[PDB]
């Protein structure tokens, strides 16, 4: 009934969300029974707050679990074994494109001669 304000959910431990998740569903699935035999409309229109609350509890469990794994993969030894789903998704091309480092690789000559002759600001005005 009613709903569970979202600031309260982010505070609670996982087991306290799982503990609370179910007992919203049990009060939902007991409202599904009330859609069959109908009385109380006042009771019947309470199905939205319970659906979205359950949508709201799962929202936290998922952002938490999604958060903890991104931290769980940090050290480069532990990188590249990270799940495909956690890696950051970019358009297929951008993810295969040359990175700003690898397109800028310059031969040892090109660096000597771009030092020997750098581009130079000037004015021909007077």
């Amino acid at each position: 009934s009613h709903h569970m304000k979202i600031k309260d959910l982010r505070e609670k431990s996982k087991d306290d969300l799982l503990k609370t998740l179910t007992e919203y569903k049990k009060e939902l699935s007991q409202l599904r029974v009330v859609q069959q035999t109908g009385g109380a409309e006042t009771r019947l229109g309470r199905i939205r707050p319970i659906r979205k609350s359950i949508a709201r509890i799962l929202t936290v469990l998922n952002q938490n679990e999604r958060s903890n794994l991104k931290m769980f993969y940090a050290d480069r030894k532990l990188r590249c074994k990270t799940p495909k789903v956690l890696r950051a998704k970019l358009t297929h091309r951008r993810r295969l494109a040359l990175k700003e480092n690898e397109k800028n690789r310059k031969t040892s000559r090109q660096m000597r001669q771009a030092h020997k002759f750098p581009k130079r600001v000037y004015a021909v005005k007077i």
Partner: peptide, 23 residues
């Protein structure tokens, strides 16, 4: 495992049996 998300384990019943019939 690449699924992540969350599995409730106490809800797998509530998905199976929905409202009873009064017919």
């Amino acid at each position: 495992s690449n699924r992540v998300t969350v599995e409730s384990k106490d809800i797998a019943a509530f998905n199976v049996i929905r409202y009873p019939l009064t017919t």
